[PDB]
């Protein structure tokens, strides 16, 4: 049948000690709640109903919005969404702070819901302390008892409520209408709806997650960090099984997506962010950070190199200690060495910038040698200007190129030159500065 | 009552293979024995009696000193300290190589000591092999039997001696006087004092540590490394619960103290040393090392940045690959980029040094742009001299400023300039060097 | 008796997803199969028979070669090697993808082989699923039953076949000749030889490895990564017990050999490759990579320093963010600072290159100060040339030395100089460039 989702995002995240709404805190670079939304979309949800208390502005700025003005609990929260439920759709209840719930588990949950009844996700814990206990009579679920209100006998129950469940909209709206708030907490308890479904003589079927981490909620940053490590380990293991050699999968982080070829080797402490594409036989040395980059076949990134919005073609070498900024592009066989920064600049085929250089806003040809210490002066304090270097140019060490300026093919620039005017094809330019020599200084 | 501590620091650390006395080997940046002293001071010890064998010079240089001339054992060691005990104080016995003993455990130990008797810290191990066994008769402690001298029946005992205990000074001095040395080892066994206390009809009460790591001793560097990881994990978890987001708490080290604000994010492989203070919303990228630094609100430290004795005001950005040395100071909104080293220099509000620069012994104003490749020549081979740069100065790329020299407000320095004489307000200075152009080179 | 080894290297490594033969994939910097060969040589093998299917070219290029033209299984594989066995030697069967098998285990295996019979290495697993089961009758091994062909009763057996075994050559050749291929797989099963040995009334003795990891095979990169971590942890623990202080042994990698002195400290995330030699009291900061280097007593390598084929004498300091390339050599007390690259260059006693410099193909004397920004121009686009700097030379900041060129003892080079001609003893050389000053720019 058809289905929509309600994501509860309206708890108080006091133990996060944060000014950022709890469900916005990221896991693997993505807000927790977005993990949950992604899963919902994968399930084929027709609507996603997001219930919130505060941070509504930032929530909408970041990500069907449903206000819960007073933090009066989950039952009350659902009461707020209930009018938006279709009588003819299934409604899946999820939490914005339970980010690792898997599509497989949810699919099995939807499959297990008995006609007219409820599908309830439960899990058996070694220590169920503090959790809602699943109450069964002769094997069938009839009730949930919260820890606080549970008796000593009930507290021996190990099967507990994850709070994730599915029911038909018409049925759900009915059960929510029958909730009672007259009690020691002054709130409606969502958990009472399973007893209410039972009262109507309807069935509550259960399924279990595959992993405990799937139904773990985040209330503080220690708990978020554990889930971060679980998720990173999962990603790392998939990459290994898919043929990427991670030299230490416990020291690898992916925060986005990695599209990869064959026989790649990634060394320790590499961080991949955004969407990165790696060709065949790429090697990434220790400590590198890549964000939104494309790296061509057989390229080698040496240790402690940082790249963002950069492109390497095949057979390129970069680093160690290089810094590629957005718009940095290396054509086939180009080389960028240590203590070199490239920004919005292209280095043509086989061209080399091996040391202690800044190349910004530059179009550099093929077969070019950029000597150590070369710098493009691309900024006048108001605007930025382009440097153009042709093919087969030799730029001597510690030269400044003062943009806008063009150096034609075949030219040679002497060490220590300040280039302010265009250089013609096959021209040598060199500073003829006079020195004083003083004997016996 | 009143209390003093005896710390035993006189064992042979042969399996450390070190020229540094064993108890001086650090854990989280602090000698093991100093952890123990700190705990003692927290307990309110009136005196700390440190018993040593060798390395006394270095020990005192590093940290009431009590010689044990001949390594004749713990009983003998205590005999050496006994004359310093007051008849009217409690004496707590600790070890310099058991660094994680907690104040809580010790407080409970002091509370459990029966009048006229002994408080003894014991622990139950899955494998008690090699440890002193606690001998009980009808539930009461009467004895300790060392493993070697224990029978097969005794060796089944899992409750073992940690060697940590407390007794009144007068009582202790008596029991120590009654120790016998005529045996297969020629030494007095400290453990005999519990049997001696029993002989006098006094009670020996026991308490247990909360964690096994609290009473683990260090005899080799493998054991020290395990304790280092335990301690770092504890620190990391406290920081997470306190609201600091560590993106991987297994790749975080604190060796000193971290004072922090709210909504801080620290990425993998960060090392914090000395005392570091972080404002709200500070972000620290992967690989950074901070030692004795103050970082203001909303500052961002990019990957692979090293800072020591440095100060950032609010909204500053530094790195990646920047190196801030002692006396480096950034005013609000300042920026230091890649391959820049700052030493005993201040960069004023909104001023920028983005690349490949060395700024030492310099006072730099607000609104200054330091071009790539700029270097302060602060050294003449004997002394060091200051560079002063006013507000709203534009320093062109690859300039050297030869100190002492002053550049006034509003000035502009052309690329490639060697500045040796003061520059006046709103002055442009630029090198007019002649070049040779040779066609067809 | 005398002994030879057969290493099976002819499986299909489909789940590696690699163009490199599976047994060539490295563990700790060394092909898996080379670990196995090393063990064989340590055992005193007279011959090593390597059976292969494909990748024979690359295998021989990388490492008695024995073709198995058709991947028809292990029995068939051994049939191919059998003619090379001496009737009067023991033959040990190993696998190229089981890299951590220990010499101790193998020695015990060889010792346990009964005259005329077989020594078989087996292991007891918590989950034996998918493994060959060891079949015993009244305690004696008579059979091996592969999982697939095993009954439900047989599958309860926890003792499984590692496939590692030893038998006399004459005996082995006989048993291999009697293998039957007429079955649902069309292959000879090596495991049948133990039933065949039993048929002849010979004994099959068993021994067990000390660690499970010793007999773990690699079929995919996830499995290789687990073995990599096991191996690195073993190496790290040995180094700690031997007296090297690793500040985090889970963040330490050795890919080769480390020869070390006393009281060394290595911080987190250090990678040692090739053969590295460290003197006493060397400290290595976080993030460093050392490959084929010799570091003298009391030297300190600061964070994020990369060295290859480099030599430091005693009391040297390098980094942070320094890059030493092959042929880099520092004499006693020399210093290389941040953003400095040294290649095929020697820095003499007490000489300093603290910042933003490139020194290549250079002989630099003692007592030299290399100012920030100094660069050797060692390349003309075709060849490379040497720079020679004498003792007690002061090179001013941002100087280029244009090789070949010699600077004699005692000389001083002014900031910003382009040195193209030899400098005489005690000479000051300095650029006298004229500037334009424009007021009110
Ligand atoms: N300094 C030059 C030298 O580098 P090194 O000798 O350090 O490799 O030659 C390289 C090519 O071989 C050039 O690209 C560098 O500009
Ligand atoms: N090279 C200049 C350029 O940097 P980039 O263009 O690399 O950011 O402009 C920056 C301000 O926008 C200046 O501080 C840098 O000195
Ligand atoms: N810039 C100089 C300064 O460095 P710093 O003042 O940054 O240590 O003096 C050092 C010696 O003291 C010299 O080697 C450096 O060349
Ligand atoms: Mg210059
Ligand atoms: Mg320069």
């Amino acid at each position: 049948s058809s289905m929509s989702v309600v994501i509860l995002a309206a708890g108080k995240g006091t133990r996060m000690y944060s000014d950022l709404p709890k469900v916005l805190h990221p896991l693997a670079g993505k807000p927790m709640v977005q993990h949950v939304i992604d899963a919902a979309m994968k399930l084929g949800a027709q609507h996603v109903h997001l219930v919130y208390g505060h941070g509504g502005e930032l929530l909408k700025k970041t990500l069907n919005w449903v206000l819960q003005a007073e933090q009066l609990g989950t039952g009350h929260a659902m009461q707020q969404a209930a009018p938006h439920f279709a009588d003819d759709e299934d409604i899946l209840m999820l939490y914005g702070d339970v980010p690792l719930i898997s599509v497989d588990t949810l699919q099995r949950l939807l499959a297990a819901k008995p006609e007219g009844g409820i599908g309830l996700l439960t899990v058996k814990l070694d220590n169920p302390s503090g959790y809602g206990r699943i109450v069964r009579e002769n094997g069938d679920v009839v009730g949930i008892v919260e820890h606080k209100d549970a008796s000593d006998a009930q507290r021996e129950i190990n099967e507990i409520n994850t709070g994730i469940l599915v029911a038909n909209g018409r049925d759900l709206k009915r059960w929510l209408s029958l909730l009672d708030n007259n009690n020691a907490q002054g709130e409606f308890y969502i958990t009472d709806i399973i007893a209410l479904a039972h009262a109507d003589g309807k069935k509550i079927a259960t399924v279990h997650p595959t992993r405990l981490s799937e139904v773990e909620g985040v209330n503080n940053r220690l708990q978020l960090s554990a889930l971060e490590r679980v998720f990173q380990t999962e990603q790392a293991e998939k990459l290994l099984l898919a043929g990427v050699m991670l030299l230490d999968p416990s020291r690898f982080d992916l925060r986005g997506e990695l599209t990869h070829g064959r026989d790649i080797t990634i060394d320790t402490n590499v961080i991949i962010e955004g969407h990165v594409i790696l060709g065949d036989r790429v090697r990434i040395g220790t400590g590198c950070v890549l964000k939104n980059c494309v790296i061509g076949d057989d390229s080698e990134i040496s240790p402690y190199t940082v790249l963002e919005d950069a492109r390497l073609d095949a057979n390129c070498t970069v680093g160690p200690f290089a810094r590629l900024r957005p718009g940095a592009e290396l054509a086939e066989g180009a080389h960028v060495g240590n203590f070199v920064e490239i920004k919005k600049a292209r280095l043509g085929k086989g061209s080399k910038a091996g040391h202690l250089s800044y190349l910004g806003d530059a179009e550099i040809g093929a077969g070019v040698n950029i000597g150590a210490g070369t710098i493009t002066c691309n900024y006048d304090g108001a605007n930025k200007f382009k440097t153009i270097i042709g093919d087969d140019v030799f730029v001597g060490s510690d030269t400044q190129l003062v943009a806008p300026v063009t150096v034609a093919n075949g030219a040679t620039i002497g060490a220590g030159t300040t280039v302010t005017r265009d250089v013609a094809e096959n021209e040598l330019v060199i500073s003829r500065v006079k020195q004083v020599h003083i004997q016996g200084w």
Side-chain angles (χ1 to χ4, degrees), chain A residues 371-377 393-403 405 407 411-420 422-423 427-431 433:
Chain A
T374 300
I375 292 165
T376 51
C377 165
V393 172
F394 193 87
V395 182
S397 296
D398 210 35
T399 282
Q400 319 96 36
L401 305 148
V402 187
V405 73
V407 174
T412 303
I413 309 300
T417 304
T418 307
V419 185
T420 58
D422 293 350
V423 177
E427 181 173 31
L428 174 68
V429 187
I430 46 147
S431 206
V433 55

mmCIF file of all heavy atoms in Angstrom, chain A residues 371-377 393-403 405 407 411-423 427-433, unseen atoms left out:
data_model
loop_
_atom_site.group_PDB
_atom_site.id
_atom_site.type_symbol
_atom_site.label_atom_id
_atom_site.label_comp_id
_atom_site.label_asym_id
_atom_site.label_seq_id
_atom_site.Cartn_x
_atom_site.Cartn_y
_atom_site.Cartn_z
ATOM 1 N N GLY A 371 60.070 27.404 -11.262
ATOM 2 C CA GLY A 371 61.119 27.286 -10.267
ATOM 3 C C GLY A 371 60.644 27.533 -8.846
ATOM 4 O O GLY A 371 59.630 28.182 -8.593
ATOM 5 N N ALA A 372 61.381 26.990 -7.899
ATOM 6 C CA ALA A 372 61.110 27.235 -6.488
ATOM 7 C C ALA A 372 60.935 28.727 -6.206
ATOM 8 O O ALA A 372 61.679 29.576 -6.724
ATOM 9 C CB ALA A 372 62.261 26.681 -5.660
ATOM 10 N N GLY A 373 59.976 29.067 -5.375
ATOM 11 C CA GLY A 373 59.857 30.445 -4.924
ATOM 12 C C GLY A 373 59.059 31.346 -5.829
ATOM 13 O O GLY A 373 58.907 32.523 -5.528
ATOM 14 N N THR A 374 58.547 30.808 -6.934
ATOM 15 C CA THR A 374 57.727 31.592 -7.862
ATOM 16 C C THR A 374 56.347 31.909 -7.277
ATOM 17 O O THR A 374 55.680 31.053 -6.705
ATOM 18 C CB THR A 374 57.559 30.837 -9.183
ATOM 19 O OG1 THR A 374 58.852 30.626 -9.754
ATOM 20 C CG2 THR A 374 56.684 31.642 -10.193
ATOM 21 N N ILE A 375 55.921 33.139 -7.484
ATOM 22 C CA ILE A 375 54.659 33.646 -6.978
ATOM 23 C C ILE A 375 53.922 34.482 -8.014
ATOM 24 O O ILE A 375 54.494 35.391 -8.651
ATOM 25 C CB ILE A 375 54.912 34.547 -5.759
ATOM 26 C CG1 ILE A 375 55.435 33.704 -4.590
ATOM 27 C CG2 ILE A 375 53.644 35.324 -5.380
ATOM 28 C CD1 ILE A 375 56.045 34.539 -3.475
ATOM 29 N N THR A 376 52.641 34.190 -8.187
ATOM 30 C CA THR A 376 51.781 35.053 -8.979
ATOM 31 C C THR A 376 51.209 36.131 -8.056
ATOM 32 O O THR A 376 50.564 35.809 -7.045
ATOM 33 C CB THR A 376 50.593 34.276 -9.573
ATOM 34 O OG1 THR A 376 49.936 33.549 -8.533
ATOM 35 C CG2 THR A 376 51.055 33.279 -10.646
ATOM 36 N N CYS A 377 51.447 37.385 -8.405
ATOM 37 C CA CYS A 377 50.814 38.522 -7.727
ATOM 38 C C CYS A 377 49.499 38.801 -8.427
ATOM 39 O O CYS A 377 49.445 39.522 -9.408
ATOM 40 C CB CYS A 377 51.697 39.776 -7.751
ATOM 41 S SG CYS A 377 50.812 41.336 -7.325
ATOM 42 N N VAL A 393 57.967 27.030 -21.198
ATOM 43 C CA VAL A 393 58.511 28.166 -20.503
ATOM 44 C C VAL A 393 59.296 27.695 -19.271
ATOM 45 O O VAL A 393 58.886 26.763 -18.545
ATOM 46 C CB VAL A 393 57.381 29.151 -20.078
ATOM 47 C CG1 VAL A 393 57.912 30.249 -19.191
ATOM 48 C CG2 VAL A 393 56.722 29.758 -21.315
ATOM 49 N N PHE A 394 60.442 28.327 -19.058
ATOM 50 C CA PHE A 394 61.266 28.069 -17.893
ATOM 51 C C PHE A 394 61.233 29.312 -17.014
ATOM 52 O O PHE A 394 61.756 30.373 -17.385
ATOM 53 C CB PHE A 394 62.694 27.751 -18.330
ATOM 54 C CG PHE A 394 63.546 27.165 -17.234
ATOM 55 C CD1 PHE A 394 63.559 25.801 -17.007
ATOM 56 C CD2 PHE A 394 64.323 27.985 -16.424
ATOM 57 C CE1 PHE A 394 64.340 25.257 -16.002
ATOM 58 C CE2 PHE A 394 65.106 27.447 -15.410
ATOM 59 C CZ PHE A 394 65.112 26.082 -15.202
ATOM 60 N N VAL A 395 60.564 29.210 -15.881
ATOM 61 C CA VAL A 395 60.523 30.327 -14.940
ATOM 62 C C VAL A 395 61.565 30.122 -13.843
ATOM 63 O O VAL A 395 61.456 29.205 -13.039
ATOM 64 C CB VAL A 395 59.150 30.468 -14.299
ATOM 65 C CG1 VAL A 395 59.136 31.676 -13.356
ATOM 66 C CG2 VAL A 395 58.077 30.632 -15.390
ATOM 67 N N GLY A 396 62.585 30.967 -13.832
ATOM 68 C CA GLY A 396 63.639 30.878 -12.833
ATOM 69 C C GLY A 396 63.169 31.101 -11.406
ATOM 70 O O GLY A 396 62.151 31.753 -11.154
ATOM 71 N N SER A 397 63.933 30.577 -10.459
ATOM 72 C CA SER A 397 63.536 30.620 -9.049
ATOM 73 C C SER A 397 63.257 32.036 -8.536
ATOM 74 O O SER A 397 63.899 33.001 -8.964
ATOM 75 C CB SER A 397 64.625 30.000 -8.178
ATOM 76 O OG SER A 397 64.789 28.639 -8.479
ATOM 77 N N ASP A 398 62.301 32.136 -7.615
ATOM 78 C CA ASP A 398 62.020 33.367 -6.873
ATOM 79 C C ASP A 398 61.613 34.530 -7.785
ATOM 80 O O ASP A 398 61.963 35.677 -7.537
ATOM 81 C CB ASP A 398 63.221 33.792 -6.034
ATOM 82 C CG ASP A 398 62.801 34.540 -4.772
ATOM 83 O OD1 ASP A 398 61.745 34.198 -4.206
ATOM 84 O OD2 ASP A 398 63.505 35.474 -4.369
ATOM 85 N N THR A 399 60.885 34.198 -8.840
ATOM 86 C CA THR A 399 60.316 35.172 -9.754
ATOM 87 C C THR A 399 58.927 35.552 -9.261
ATOM 88 O O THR A 399 58.188 34.699 -8.765
ATOM 89 C CB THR A 399 60.195 34.538 -11.172
ATOM 90 O OG1 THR A 399 61.472 34.532 -11.801
ATOM 91 C CG2 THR A 399 59.234 35.310 -12.056
ATOM 92 N N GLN A 400 58.558 36.818 -9.402
ATOM 93 C CA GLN A 400 57.170 37.225 -9.217
ATOM 94 C C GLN A 400 56.584 37.589 -10.571
ATOM 95 O O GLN A 400 57.181 38.354 -11.340
ATOM 96 C CB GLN A 400 57.022 38.420 -8.278
ATOM 97 C CG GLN A 400 57.926 38.383 -7.043
ATOM 98 C CD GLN A 400 59.190 39.176 -7.223
ATOM 99 O OE1 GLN A 400 59.188 40.217 -7.869
ATOM 100 N NE2 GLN A 400 60.277 38.699 -6.650
ATOM 101 N N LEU A 401 55.401 37.062 -10.844
ATOM 102 C CA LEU A 401 54.673 37.407 -12.059
ATOM 103 C C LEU A 401 53.543 38.325 -11.649
ATOM 104 O O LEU A 401 52.673 37.924 -10.892
ATOM 105 C CB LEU A 401 54.116 36.157 -12.714
ATOM 106 C CG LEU A 401 55.192 35.097 -12.987
ATOM 107 C CD1 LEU A 401 54.657 33.696 -12.888
ATOM 108 C CD2 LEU A 401 55.787 35.334 -14.342
ATOM 109 N N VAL A 402 53.586 39.561 -12.124
ATOM 110 C CA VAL A 402 52.628 40.579 -11.696
ATOM 111 C C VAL A 402 51.496 40.703 -12.703
ATOM 112 O O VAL A 402 51.659 41.310 -13.767
ATOM 113 C CB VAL A 402 53.294 41.957 -11.487
ATOM 114 C CG1 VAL A 402 52.304 42.941 -10.867
ATOM 115 C CG2 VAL A 402 54.505 41.823 -10.584
ATOM 116 N N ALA A 403 50.351 40.123 -12.351
ATOM 117 C CA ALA A 403 49.210 40.042 -13.251
ATOM 118 C C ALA A 403 48.520 41.396 -13.396
ATOM 119 O O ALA A 403 48.555 42.194 -12.467
ATOM 120 C CB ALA A 403 48.235 39.006 -12.737
ATOM 121 N N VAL A 405 49.527 39.548 -16.886
ATOM 122 C CA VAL A 405 50.733 39.450 -17.677
ATOM 123 C C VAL A 405 50.765 38.123 -18.397
ATOM 124 O O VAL A 405 50.262 37.103 -17.893
ATOM 125 C CB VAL A 405 52.011 39.615 -16.808
ATOM 126 C CG1 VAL A 405 52.256 38.382 -15.963
ATOM 127 C CG2 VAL A 405 53.199 39.913 -17.683
ATOM 128 N N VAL A 407 53.270 35.424 -20.608
ATOM 129 C CA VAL A 407 54.579 34.935 -20.985
ATOM 130 C C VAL A 407 54.372 33.922 -22.130
ATOM 131 O O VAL A 407 53.720 32.890 -21.937
ATOM 132 C CB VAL A 407 55.269 34.297 -19.791
ATOM 133 C CG1 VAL A 407 56.584 33.655 -20.201
ATOM 134 C CG2 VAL A 407 55.483 35.345 -18.661
ATOM 135 N N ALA A 411 59.697 30.941 -23.751
ATOM 136 C CA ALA A 411 60.437 31.967 -23.044
ATOM 137 C C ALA A 411 61.188 31.413 -21.828
ATOM 138 O O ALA A 411 60.850 30.346 -21.296
ATOM 139 C CB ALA A 411 59.506 33.080 -22.640
ATOM 140 N N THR A 412 62.195 32.159 -21.384
ATOM 141 C CA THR A 412 62.969 31.838 -20.189
ATOM 142 C C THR A 412 63.005 33.074 -19.294
ATOM 143 O O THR A 412 63.322 34.189 -19.757
ATOM 144 C CB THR A 412 64.404 31.409 -20.566
ATOM 145 O OG1 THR A 412 64.342 30.303 -21.466
ATOM 146 C CG2 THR A 412 65.226 31.005 -19.342
ATOM 147 N N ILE A 413 62.680 32.887 -18.019
ATOM 148 C CA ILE A 413 62.734 33.971 -17.038
ATOM 149 C C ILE A 413 63.877 33.671 -16.068
ATOM 150 O O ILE A 413 63.913 32.612 -15.461
ATOM 151 C CB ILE A 413 61.452 34.099 -16.216
ATOM 152 C CG1 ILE A 413 60.199 34.168 -17.097
ATOM 153 C CG2 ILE A 413 61.528 35.315 -15.282
ATOM 154 C CD1 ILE A 413 60.181 35.301 -18.043
ATOM 155 N N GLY A 414 64.806 34.601 -15.932
ATOM 156 C CA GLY A 414 65.935 34.432 -15.023
ATOM 157 C C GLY A 414 65.510 34.432 -13.569
ATOM 158 O O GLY A 414 64.477 34.981 -13.213
ATOM 159 N N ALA A 415 66.321 33.823 -12.718
ATOM 160 C CA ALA A 415 66.049 33.805 -11.302
ATOM 161 C C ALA A 415 65.903 35.234 -10.800
ATOM 162 O O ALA A 415 66.625 36.146 -11.225
ATOM 163 C CB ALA A 415 67.161 33.096 -10.548
ATOM 164 N N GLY A 416 64.970 35.419 -9.880
ATOM 165 C CA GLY A 416 64.833 36.675 -9.184
ATOM 166 C C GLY A 416 64.167 37.766 -9.992
ATOM 167 O O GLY A 416 64.251 38.904 -9.616
ATOM 168 N N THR A 417 63.473 37.428 -11.069
ATOM 169 C CA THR A 417 62.877 38.461 -11.915
ATOM 170 C C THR A 417 61.507 38.900 -11.423
ATOM 171 O O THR A 417 60.724 38.090 -10.935
ATOM 172 C CB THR A 417 62.761 37.986 -13.396
ATOM 173 O OG1 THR A 417 64.054 37.589 -13.860
ATOM 174 C CG2 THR A 417 62.269 39.112 -14.308
ATOM 175 N N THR A 418 61.237 40.191 -11.527
ATOM 176 C CA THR A 418 59.889 40.711 -11.325
ATOM 177 C C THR A 418 59.290 40.993 -12.692
ATOM 178 O O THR A 418 59.677 41.953 -13.354
ATOM 179 C CB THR A 418 59.905 42.001 -10.521
ATOM 180 O OG1 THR A 418 60.638 41.786 -9.309
ATOM 181 C CG2 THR A 418 58.469 42.471 -10.204
ATOM 182 N N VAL A 419 58.380 40.135 -13.127
ATOM 183 C CA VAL A 419 57.809 40.246 -14.467
ATOM 184 C C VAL A 419 56.542 41.088 -14.437
ATOM 185 O O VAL A 419 55.536 40.680 -13.847
ATOM 186 C CB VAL A 419 57.473 38.850 -15.031
ATOM 187 C CG1 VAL A 419 57.004 38.958 -16.477
ATOM 188 C CG2 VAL A 419 58.680 37.951 -14.946
ATOM 189 N N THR A 420 56.600 42.271 -15.054
ATOM 190 C CA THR A 420 55.453 43.170 -15.073
ATOM 191 C C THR A 420 54.911 43.431 -16.480
ATOM 192 O O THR A 420 53.834 43.986 -16.630
ATOM 193 C CB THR A 420 55.796 44.525 -14.458
ATOM 194 O OG1 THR A 420 56.880 45.096 -15.186
ATOM 195 C CG2 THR A 420 56.197 44.371 -13.006
ATOM 196 N N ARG A 421 55.650 43.039 -17.505
ATOM 197 C CA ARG A 421 55.219 43.291 -18.872
ATOM 198 C C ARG A 421 55.340 42.005 -19.663
ATOM 199 O O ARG A 421 56.167 41.167 -19.341
ATOM 200 C CB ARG A 421 56.088 44.390 -19.521
ATOM 201 C CG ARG A 421 55.905 45.780 -18.906
ATOM 202 C CD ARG A 421 56.903 46.784 -19.485
ATOM 203 N N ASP A 422 54.503 41.853 -20.685
ATOM 204 C CA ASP A 422 54.426 40.606 -21.440
ATOM 205 C C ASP A 422 55.797 40.189 -21.968
ATOM 206 O O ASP A 422 56.630 41.036 -22.329
ATOM 207 C CB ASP A 422 53.459 40.726 -22.627
ATOM 208 C CG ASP A 422 52.015 40.900 -22.204
ATOM 209 O OD1 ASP A 422 51.698 40.753 -21.003
ATOM 210 O OD2 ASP A 422 51.185 41.205 -23.082
ATOM 211 N N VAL A 423 56.020 38.878 -21.999
ATOM 212 C CA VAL A 423 57.258 38.304 -22.508
ATOM 213 C C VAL A 423 56.975 37.589 -23.831
ATOM 214 O O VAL A 423 56.050 36.779 -23.909
ATOM 215 C CB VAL A 423 57.863 37.341 -21.492
ATOM 216 C CG1 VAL A 423 59.117 36.679 -22.027
ATOM 217 C CG2 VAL A 423 58.179 38.094 -20.208
ATOM 218 N N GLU A 427 61.899 34.506 -25.784
ATOM 219 C CA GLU A 427 62.665 35.598 -25.196
ATOM 220 C C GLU A 427 63.234 35.192 -23.841
ATOM 221 O O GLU A 427 62.563 34.515 -23.067
ATOM 222 C CB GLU A 427 61.759 36.835 -25.052
ATOM 223 C CG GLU A 427 62.426 38.060 -24.474
ATOM 224 C CD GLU A 427 61.533 39.301 -24.516
ATOM 225 O OE1 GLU A 427 60.297 39.181 -24.420
ATOM 226 O OE2 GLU A 427 62.077 40.412 -24.658
ATOM 227 N N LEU A 428 64.478 35.582 -23.570
ATOM 228 C CA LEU A 428 65.040 35.521 -22.223
ATOM 229 C C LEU A 428 64.875 36.888 -21.569
ATOM 230 O O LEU A 428 65.229 37.931 -22.166
ATOM 231 C CB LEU A 428 66.539 35.179 -22.277
ATOM 232 C CG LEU A 428 67.314 35.225 -20.954
ATOM 233 C CD1 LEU A 428 66.873 34.124 -20.036
ATOM 234 C CD2 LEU A 428 68.841 35.126 -21.175
ATOM 235 N N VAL A 429 64.337 36.879 -20.362
ATOM 236 C CA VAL A 429 64.229 38.074 -19.551
ATOM 237 C C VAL A 429 64.992 37.861 -18.256
ATOM 238 O O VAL A 429 64.757 36.879 -17.531
ATOM 239 C CB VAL A 429 62.779 38.390 -19.206
ATOM 240 C CG1 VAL A 429 62.687 39.734 -18.506
ATOM 241 C CG2 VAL A 429 61.933 38.377 -20.442
ATOM 242 N N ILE A 430 65.839 38.814 -17.913
ATOM 243 C CA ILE A 430 66.616 38.705 -16.719
ATOM 244 C C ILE A 430 67.021 39.998 -16.124
ATOM 245 O O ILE A 430 67.370 40.902 -16.800
ATOM 246 C CB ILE A 430 67.924 38.015 -16.956
ATOM 247 C CG1 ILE A 430 68.617 38.548 -18.185
ATOM 248 C CG2 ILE A 430 67.749 36.551 -17.018
ATOM 249 C CD1 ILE A 430 70.078 38.524 -18.007
ATOM 250 N N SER A 431 67.004 40.031 -14.817
ATOM 251 C CA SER A 431 67.302 41.230 -14.072
ATOM 252 C C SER A 431 68.814 41.442 -14.093
ATOM 253 O O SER A 431 69.587 40.536 -13.795
ATOM 254 C CB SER A 431 66.794 41.079 -12.634
ATOM 255 O OG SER A 431 66.517 42.337 -12.045
ATOM 256 N N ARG A 432 69.236 42.634 -14.483
ATOM 257 C CA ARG A 432 70.647 42.984 -14.430
ATOM 258 C C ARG A 432 70.838 43.950 -13.289
ATOM 259 O O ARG A 432 70.967 45.158 -13.514
ATOM 260 C CB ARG A 432 71.103 43.629 -15.747
ATOM 261 N N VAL A 433 70.835 43.436 -12.066
ATOM 262 C CA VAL A 433 71.058 44.296 -10.911
ATOM 263 C C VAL A 433 72.538 44.340 -10.507
ATOM 264 O O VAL A 433 73.250 43.334 -10.528
ATOM 265 C CB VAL A 433 70.149 43.943 -9.706
ATOM 266 C CG1 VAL A 433 70.279 42.476 -9.306
ATOM 267 C CG2 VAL A 433 70.463 44.864 -8.530
#
